[model samples]
Target chain A: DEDLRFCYDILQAVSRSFAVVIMELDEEMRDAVCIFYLVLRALDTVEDDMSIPVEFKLRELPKFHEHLHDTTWCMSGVGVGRERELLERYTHVTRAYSRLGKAYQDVISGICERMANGMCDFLTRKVETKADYDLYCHYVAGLVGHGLTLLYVSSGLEDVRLADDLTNANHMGLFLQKTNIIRDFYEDICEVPPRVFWPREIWEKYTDDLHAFKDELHEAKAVECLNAMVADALVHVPHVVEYLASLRDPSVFAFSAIPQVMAMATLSLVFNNKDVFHTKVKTTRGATARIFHYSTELQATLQMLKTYTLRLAARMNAQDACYDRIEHLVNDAIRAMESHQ
Target chain B: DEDLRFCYDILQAVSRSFAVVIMELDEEMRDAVCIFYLVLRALDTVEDDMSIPVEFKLRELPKFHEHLHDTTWCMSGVGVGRERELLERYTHVTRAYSRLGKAYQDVISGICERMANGMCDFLTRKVETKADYDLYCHYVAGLVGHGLTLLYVSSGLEDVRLADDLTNANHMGLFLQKTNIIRDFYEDICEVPPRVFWPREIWEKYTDDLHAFKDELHEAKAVECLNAMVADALVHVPHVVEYLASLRDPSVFAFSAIPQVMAMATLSLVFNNKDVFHTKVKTTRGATARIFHYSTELQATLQMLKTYTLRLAARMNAQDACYDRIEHLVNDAIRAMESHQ
Candidate 1:
């Protein structure tokens, strides 16, 4: 039992929430998906190694796919977290990747290189427009959505309908990326690379610099930025609901649904909260478990989203930049509920 | 012999081009892909059946997936050409869809239903913007590309590199759709639906109405429309080439490569030619055979794309809208080639 579940132990070490949530997946999918997540983490570690120098990193991004399969491939870095450990000792993940079925190996390695290359393109540029934000998200998160959908379809557990609507799949990734981006706003600015994920197209109205928005003095303006990004995320709700509704197996359904449930729930907590600007943000553990318990139920998820939107609504003033837009998004979700039903 | 290849015969009757191309795939994938194409055809048939009353067509479009598996579903329409016969004999396609392997059935059925619902949403709307045009291509062609990639990955014939590249898969469909739209400019206006595919974002700079670009009166302006559209299509070249590059089997490679070759060859013929205004347009059969013959190699495909875009360049003047733009696009492809290499 020691190295038997080595992947899960590594997964839990690096990403506890996903490791726990991934347990809800079809037992067979657990290993491959854990390996998939770690490979990307390794890929990200490569991208995040500021000591690697931008030129060396950009040059290697397109080559990561090959590295995942190469025995000589290794990267080392100085850091303390599970991610840094995985990076320095990257061979563990690649070893797991090598042991996967040909089909699984094909997709995981394929996306690793693609995701790495796409990150390189934007590594030099900050997200500026809505399109830029989406393009960046598509690589980091949307690619995962597509990659996950591909895996799901390959597993033949979920309906092909999700992949066909495609937007449903796109929204799955976008919603998750937006949720992570919003929560990591403080972390991203404080980190060594000091990147900005806030799209100036929406945030320029509130402030000139994303990092500067973190000052407690800028709390009001920062909350306005949160309002707008959350509004955009809410717009993906109907598609998210449609994606979840297509899972034929409950395990797969739960695996897919929990994060979305957690995302909006966290959105409810983080929206317009100044505390979010200064510290880490997340859904409560109890709320998350409750959401996980009811995930396979569409009505429960919709209720969760509606409740979060209400939380957002309670905090908004008439003067918020996207205040009315948020209201309209809520109305759209309500209308979507009646329409889908 | 009469009924043995009912599905194959229907494919030939309505789209000989695809029928010819389908024969080039590994024999194992040919049948499933044929059915995948024909079911989508049936969906379009249902959506195109103007005599069925818009309500019945609309009502059924959203339900095409279930119809694929149901025994009694049928629709009758008075269609004049091969496409019309397809609408009247839609049952044959469903019967074939039913006989497909479960895995094949999953994807074909999934795409058919998703595509039908999408067509229904836009059934009455005219394309007016780039977003509208892309969304339309995304369903009509990109969906096909996505579906084909799903089938390809499912079949385990291609490299897994493709699976992670859902967007690249989409661009494959989009590049073909753009080629078809440019070549079929007159047919779309003179034929049924009387619709336009030109995004106003590019076309309005040349003319006000998309349909009138076909009038002999606007021949020069139509070339600019062609120029811009061709340039837009060229942006997807690197992706298309990358997709083709990942094909591991020669037969599968040839099967996938033929249409892309034919598309660029046709673009060369269709570019800046007013004869396309009232007449059919395409590359000569001799040149098409040459393209299909030379289709399997990487260098050859790039040469073909370069050659076709060159044919258009020979006809361009400084006044041609985006004359510099097309040159700029070729340079980007050049840079893309060097960067990727």
Candidate 2:
């Protein structure tokens, strides 16, 4: 229908990486997966849109899950760029969602429904503790992992431990997100004024601001904060590698691989790098291809990740306060590979 | 040391079933294993002894772990029967713990210290939710599984997987403990007048009391409550089996099997059997012999467990409110057995 086409157009405009990944999945699942992302993206727009008051967002979140069942439901004037495009045509996504096979549709809607409750829970109160940071990410990113796992199981792969527990999957989402948070120290907070908590346990060790690494003067302390975050991201490397290893389908493995491999590479780049506040950190396009290329086979991917982790470990500054912890985490990730996923 | 012999005597006097199981372990681990249980049992006396004020028990639990370092350390005044005999002579157990190798001692002390904190936390607040119920059991029973797994790993068991995550081990403890709770409904609560919980979400479906089946008039409502709790225990079947399968050593598997198999059989007996409130429910000694005799190898144990689970399923009353959920959980347990230890 015209509505479904509009939803796809909105998706392509909203996230090129997601478009690439979702399109690679089997045709039977891809459409449902695409609509699922758009539904969440639309929900996110409702939450992220500066124009939407916190009260309105909180009120609408509980309803957004219900809105998935209503084809006429749409929220407008709450976003910009691709978000604006997606939110404007969200009803199209809802229509597509309704057309999905029952199994795919229920799992996706169920997660979104639960996630809406969680979103309201945190939004009603700003993030404060490290637990708050984890819960907030669980509501947003972790649920994305959950929704994807349900779709994977519906596609009938017996190898999925993802359904058994999504803590690793949640971490997959969390590691990528905290990387973004660590990278976007100034801008994201500047936008809705990001409220996160590093747990006083972690932040108290080095303080003052989220962009501590952004300032040249705070280089001494900033290095510790960034390294701490980097070590935290590395904890998920084995989990991601093991998750990919368990994927029986080639397309699913490669699709999931793109974001995970790139996230680790970003961690390697951002570790102790002071340019994050002023510039977006990314691996060069060649390095990106190298990651995609070398990470095909499971052992090879493990080797590459271990090697990548080493490169970061080598680059870590001796004067850096977190050198000890980052070093310990790198070794821990390697040992964890022997046991996990 | 003569102190070790004295501790063994204390163990036999304190609990014969416990003494039998812990003594079957290879000599390399027996001393610390015995000390571990004795330490916990001694700690339990502190927690359970009504004469000790809550503040005193709460204060003493956190120090019991420390007391392990003091060979001459002993506390008296809060035990009965053989417990009184063991409690006054607790210093013998401490000296035995001190004699164990550093590695074993570290694990034993670490578990004890953390459990002390947990005991104090729960003792201070009381169990009020499903989460509290779980954490409280984790402190009492889950830690026992944990301490045992550490011992198994330290002893070089190739099939041991419990060391990987505490969830399955915790479930192993929980299923057994919950069953014990079911069996002792009138007796255990009768002694302590326990202020208990099961998260209103589960129990509210039946009635207000923990002994939802205690009254003769409420027998109908109570069977459903019993079935719900049975189904809940059924969920852990695979975990117990899988954990047992991970044990390469015969005595180790058999030792763990002793409680797990008996618990499931008792589960089969107690599921919807309202006689529990009138009299203590138990699996006969004849059936107890069958469980240990038949469940020798991991596969045999798996099959035996499957058969026992089915026996319960076959007996499930069709009019039972939880009949569907009960059957679903039984199938889930069997399926889980296929994939796990």
Candidate 3:
């Protein structure tokens, strides 16, 4: 009962936040996005659990493929016992997603399976170099971005320009994940024996001053990394904002605008914090509630520019290191949006 | 390197054993059975290793399904890790089998995916009851039996009448796995921390004298249980034997007889032992060589009878309290074989 209750609370938090943004959308799009968030979160829990051995995780990764084909093996509270609640939540979402129409369901399931498999493969092997790690991250996160784009189009959102920027959307997802890795490095190393995302080179530096204030220096480097990652992530925002603007349906724009706004707000918090490990940055509950209130607005163009400017500013701040790079990328995105206009 | 070599040893031993049996088969039947064995063993390794958690294992299991559809993923091993070796062997055999123009690769892959999913589900949960444990074994082992039966019919060694006995073959697979559980009980309890196959009711008895001379008493009950289980298994042996007897090719009959005979010999050694925990019960290399030698002299009629009788004697000797129930079951099997004749 405790496990079930925990799962319900997490799902409720995730669903309620998304629901406020997409409040104006029809039942189908809302359901699809909600299911997507739940499934992806469930997978994240599985990937993050450090207690279970990697070999066992690798063995079980393939069953999600079976899930895509309609054979539901309810492994609700099994392998990662420490994360039973999260897994139960995952099963709840999987069961609901299973009931959806076949084609969309298969796509969603296939994407999750692919991501989980890619994560397992990456963790178990040496991976050798940065290219391998990047490729692995793309498989795990980039594929999800692509999957979300497909689902968005499939939901009949008339956002051709947005749909066209699939590459940027994928990079956005990659940036978010990579930023999480960079920001959470200290907590990951201290709490878990093996910190996977820290590059091998950085790890060697930690050995020189294992317990000193070396984490501060590491945190500063990580912040720089996070900023650069986010700059790359924001390339998709102009197209996303245009998609929101292009929607005749105000409800859809509201739904789409909420998350994009939240994402930029979160990225800003990441950018402002040099000591990210010590300071856990998040959007305040009050800020989130305020965004929900604005969801009632029906002005599609206003919502689009608001989101676009927030994303652009976040991108510029993230790319401060390479001042020219930020200007070029953001200007190109703006030009693309103008062409759509 | 040692671990890698150890894995290679296991793979080589299993392959060699399988290959020796295949050498006794006609070209057509050998090709099909070889492919089946290769895939099944590869899957078995993926199932056995505990380094990875169950969730991750389930995620990757579906790649085999994709491999069946498009050999592209199969050849590249692009995303798969240590599992690539097993997949490589599987691809090699499946390719050979495909050349024969009787491809059951899809069906085999589907069954494997389903079985792996079932296993992941079980591993994710705390299995508490006998029925749940039995179902788990059936999923992992019983399904293999069903797949083998399909392959057997397709190989053209046996008539299609054995299709009705597919469930019985599944029971036999369960029987083998249960035997392994009993034989490994002590090692499993002390080292693995969870002895899964032990019924909850007997947990107290097992722990009360965990290291004393309690094995004899336990062995009596184990033998009884095994007899009941094998009686269930033997009901389908008649169909299998009849199918083997009907094979016009002596080499094909030898291929079928060798494994079943070897299984009986191995089971006999284990059943005779009081200290299966410390002592191994496997047949020696010399004995196995002798068994292979005898296979050449066996007429179709004699081979069928020998295989059935070896199984029957073990069933009869087991100290089953429900002797009448077990004997009645064996008689029914005998009747089924008579009817087939």
Candidate 4:
């Protein structure tokens, strides 16, 4: 109970959204889910800290997953706020992880290993093409989808076939990952070195400097590029619908589905608005209320997807080069919404 | 035949697109149509000559239609090229108008008077709103639609209801007018005083200076604004379909339909393309050949409209504020295409 309590408290400190959803799980699954999150959060902390040299990150990230088996393992002198606290007190998470069943422990450790390796692979290269972008997103986030699917399967709450269908899972993670990358563009672009994840093949058409968006003079190109990136993320909506609709557990489904719906709402909010280049463009509290109310049930989730898809469609300018691709994607989501009905 | 021969030669000199379609008409209606064009062309020449004082234009533009009754009337020293030549030899056109049957004469004269009055009203003001843009286009072009419909009815080739349903006629004229304005953006904006016809209500969203589009730095906003302008022109597609499909004469149908289809194809070319702000962006001879061939028959015309509608729709960007409006417009054209079948 002491170890479980430490993991749960860390989960809340690091992520409020995840804490609420993780707590929604049954007692049998809650601790495993909590420990799984803290382990990945610690891994992410390592990847995000630029002060850590590439040599050290490359040597340690892949092996960090093995540290879960060693209760004495911990790190310090990196990250900030809650992330710094999580990394410094990481042994508490490892202890909680060590107490889980073999299935839960294996799922958590395997994802951490692959995610660590994937994160290292990208740290050495630039995200140049769409293929590179997809691969990068898979490492940082898609592996989370894979791990969660395995966890659900281990809990005997989902069909085993979902484990084999990593395409849908990859898409699910890509949707969320891309949405985060798109939403955090201003934050990332304003960094010391301007940490850019939008692929060269995509944003090169808009402007030479990815950080050009911050200047009011580049507002038009910035918004156009922003819309194009949002479109790139939005194309994964069909896969998200397919993956989320297949989940059997309402609690697990909500856990998977809520973030997916929130991502859709974020895309709708940022689609063509120039404010995304400078200010925080997010859903209102009223929209959040509606999304939370509508995201738990499968049909309600589909309805939410349709609602936001149409809202995005409504905001579209038809002159965008990405229009037809998104039209097909929106139609695909609509089809998915209808087929499930 | 001597006067008829001169009119056809001058028609060819002024407009190759119109010359072919006018020659397709049965000889009886051909002369009246040619003279109607020359009369409007003369008035347009008056309005286009910047060297002419606004007071003189305002006085003469509203009274220029009365010149058709006076064989001695003529003007000079204000226009260029074919317009200059036409004005210098204006008595030739006046004599032809005197020979037309009374029905044709009244139709031509009435429209000329209204068009002249409309032209004078706009010379002293600005095209600041969509209503102003509409009224400006009507004076400059929609009244031509009014004249043509009346002539078609006078020739006993169309139902009177087609003339009464001027809403469709207005849309037809507006589509063609907006397309011309969009296509000639660079040409007009580069004029000595910059002859901008784009509505302030629309282009104001893109840039503070209407002429800012000529700068390469403004290309993104310029292209976006260009697309919005194309979308505005495109919303009249359903109206063009409704009006063109109602034509009973093959020659008249082709005359009306050719420009409408070419406008659609031109819009398709310029939708997101930035070259429009720099160079001439027009359809190739290949597209023109296909348009001339496909626009003469009803089903073929509908197919042509559908094909170009899809082409424009294919080029649309969902990030555009004009996206949904164009979506409905494209869908309306598609519905029009389907209903005709």
Candidate 5:
């Protein structure tokens, strides 16, 4: 029970939003996803730190999943975020992960194995092309979406066919990851040596240097690049909408849908708005309340998606480079919305 | 021999460039391709006609490939272009098609069936997405590239492996088709009701009406959309480069490589040029001569592609919406070019 309590304690510390949603799950499912989150979060803690030599990190990341069974496996002092304590006292997470039913254990370990190697694979990669950008998102995020679907099916809350839909599952993860990268552009670029995740193929359209977005002279260029990035994220909207509509269990649906709906709200806020390039843009608490209030079922989620997609479309500037593509994809999301009717 | 003479007579009248390339092939291969060209030219003549009723055209087109063996099957007065004679006197082409050996006949027939159905399928659909755009290119153009590879392998002029990489073969066709679409926009749009092949998703980025590109005031917008279209076509360059690099026979290489090199040259000329909105863009006889001279071998083809791609890059406007993507894909072609080194 101490291990369970420690897992919960660290989960709350690392991700507040996920902690809120994870606690709403059924007791058995809560433990499964919480342990899954902590396992990947602990893996990411190592990958996020640059102080760790590439040689050591390369060998360490590919086998992080193997350590999930070893209760004593822990890396001290390598954590860089609020998740630091979770890494320092990692045995609690491994211990909790070990107690998971074999089905849940299988899903987490399978995702962990692939996710770990993908993390190592991307260490030397530059986000130079859209293909690279998608693969990186698949590694760091899509697999999580894939894993969660496996858990849902294994728990008897969803159909086996849902797990087979790797494309939509992958889209769910990519939608969130791209939104994060766009919103975190300023935070990532402000770091020493600059942690750039926006594909160079995108931002370079608007400015010669990725860093030039910080200059006032480049605001128009920066917003154009930002809208292009937002347009890229919008490509996954219909997939996410379709995926959420297929969920049958209210708790499982709410857990999966909340973050996605929040992502839509975040994209709506950041798109065509230059504030994202200068500071972190936060969706208001009232907006979060409304999202949570309506995100518990499929119909409301469709409405939320339609409402925000149209708002996003209304912001299109005739001169924006991505104006038409964004408009085309927005209508696509609306069509997906109407299909369920 | 009289039927063969008729095929060649009309082949030269229909497409001068293709006739010249087909003649460079070995005798058997040349005859097979000439019949193949006339067959598709005959099929396309039907698809190109606006006066053809949708109901009858739909039923007629899906089975045109089946008519390859029907020596007496011919449609009169449906010819709309110089290729009209090829369609009106189609029995001569069918006679030539039937006399080819079974291997050649099988390859041509297979492509015809798929291309026929595809041509009919698009009759009811609009080019609304990039996916739709690519599929349209595949049916009409990519399949030609696919069929040619089958003929090359069937003729023992190239390895069977070249027939297996359908992606590259398909790229060969898509590249040329996209180039044709961009270059022919004015001519297509000038029709009574207008023929819009450029995807609505792409042109809408620059202007509301697909025809607004013709307005002098919208020249800058027109050129931006043009660069974007050119960038979309450039996505197939590396694929074509890799495909051409895999060719083992000199004549097969030239037959496949010449039109591709010409397409690249055409793209280089058309990128960021507003003249395409008002007039058809031509790559010039001198440029065609250099391409043919250099396109006879892999090394020279690589050099030609590199030079033209680099030339395409030089014309990039810092403000073009597609500057970064074009630059990115241009570098990808350069990398594929160097990989051969």
Candidate 6:
């Protein structure tokens, strides 16, 4: 009941926006992504409780390392300390973690250790700037993306190139964490003491002109920041796109495409306005339905590319820096494709 | 150099014992027994050290449990603590422990937990009587006999029924431990807060009659006590003999017979006025070789049994209460065997 409910709240939101883009995927590929979301969300719940002492959190991280071989440790205690209700909702997933095979267990332990070390380093140093923020995101989320890609390859759904495509995977994770940070800004500032995420300097400038500029200024600045991240993130997209394009299996192709579509939708919302702090920036229900409808078409490569380009053009404004960066990368990819041919 | 020498001493003793019985084992059976001995002895050394706290030992026990699944944990520091020299000497066997199959590992962990728990309970009670001492022997050494029987069955040497003969296995372990206890009585007394394996009441009575019992009474009492222990132990011998007879394979039957023969030899020596506290009651070097050499000779069994029976008869003439009890038990066993046909 809890797992299904979690899937309803979390995955349903993700699916509405992006599942259409990857609807051609096989059931196994789709299930893996869904499982990944639940598992990662459970881990995030463990990581995010501000009420828990940082040292205590760090100490608990090693138990996750040990749990891979023997999971009886997890049953005794976890999810009891902070944000109890929120954690309680995800308790079913924690139980499911032990049911994973030895290979998956190893990956979970390895990723958790790497992320925990990164979080510990950031907290101890007190991450200062956007650079630090990006590093933190990479540790907390990008490594997860890389880990999933490895899982995909290991599961025999993709070629070896999936494992090598770390750049795009890292950016994909960066986009998600950045979206979370922007959406949680006011809640973070109001909910906790000594809010440490945004540098004091940027907050001062951004706060001063906030009301005067209202939506337009917010949209412009949000567009600028979102585009800068997207531009870096787009560099690796060709590999992902090519990876998706090369897959002969429709289910696998759909699985690969859904995340790219989700990334684009996130970029669209962030570029549109600064209302993310008030509510999530998501594609419209109708637009999401349309994307899902078209996902299963299994069109030819050129036709699929044309459709994606049209969607990109209609949803992404020329004023947004991200639109310009996407155009540049798409053109570069086109030329590279012709040259290879 | 000291650690290396300790290793040499242990390895020499174990190898000598293995050699005396190896002819009775086929290749696979021999390998299993060798592995069992190596792993069991390594665990024994770890458990016996006084320097390591019980809590630390208990905590480390599960890591050894984890090592059965993955060897990587062993590299980190599995056997590093307590009686550092002894651990260092036997540390080579950690790799052997790691190499065991899942079944063997499970059995080893089961036995180790029982033995360790027994030791912990004994330490907490802070009392050592004959019963507690025997229980300790049962946990440490008797469990090894049980494990060996399992290994024998699993390795396809003997029938599973052999494992069901728990009484015989207990006696086998009891016989060895009794031998050690008798041989080390003086050394144990010399150690501060010494072990009281020899009955305190009996020792006190002998001291009270020091003049009358100075030499002859003391020897008679010692022989009586030793005989009773062996007689009680031999009650289980019929079960092992039944198990041996049921085995279709000659090699396995021989493997089972060798230990019984050695037990008989040692039992007879205790009755022969041997100074057990000053000199070991083990069969002499030449006799040990001859016993192994003539093990296949049917006449050898008759000869050994005769010697054993004759020793019991001689001790019965001493008119000691202990000897009278032992004589009755031995004669009952002979009568029981006669009725079995």
Measured by lDDT, the strongest candidate is: 5
Task: List TM-scores for all candidates, in order.
Answer: 0.50, 0.50, 0.41, 0.50, 0.51, 0.42
Weakest lDDT window of 10 consecutive positions for candidate 1 chain A: A332-341
Better of 4 and 6 by lDDT: 4
Worst 10 residues of 5 chain A by lDDT: A332-341
For candidate 2, give the lDDT of residue B244: 76
Q: What are the per-residue Cα lDDT tens digits for candidate 2 across B231-281?
A: 766777867866775677887777787778788888888887888767898
lDDT per residue, candidate 5, B104-221, as tens digits? 9988889998999998889998998888999999999999988998898888878867777688889999999999999988999998868988988987777899888889898888
lDDT of 3 by residue, A264-293 (tens): 556555653665556566668986666656
lDDT of candidate 4 over B1-341, digit per residue (tens)? 34555677778998878787676554346678999988888888888888888888888888888999998888877576877778888888888778788999999989999998998888889999988998999988887888888888897767877777678787888888889999999998897987879999998999999889999999989988887887778778877888887876676777788888888889888888889999889999999999887676688988888988898887767886667877887888799877877
Candidate 2: stretches off by over 4 Å = A1-341, B159-162, B195-200, B338-341
> Which has the higher DockQ value, candidate number 1 or candidate number 6?
1
Question: What docking grade applies to model 6?
Answer: incorrect
lDDT by residue for model 1 (B182-259), tens: 777788788665756777788878888777766778887877677777887877777777777777777777777788
| Poorest lDDT segment (10 consecutive residues) of candidate 2 chain B | B193-202
**Decoy 5 TM-score against native:** 0.51
Q: After TM-score superposition, what is the CA distance of residue A162 in candidate 1 from its true location, in Å? A: 3.4
For residues A115-199, what per-residue lDDT tens digits would candidate 2 score against the true structure? Answer: 8888778666765567777777788888888788778878875355558987777877887787777776656544455545454
Full candidate order by lDDT, most accurate first: 5, 4, 1, 2, 3, 6
Kept native contacts, as fractions per model, are 0.00, 0.00, 0.00, 0.00, 0.00, 0.00
Q: Model 6 — TM-score against the truth?
A: 0.42
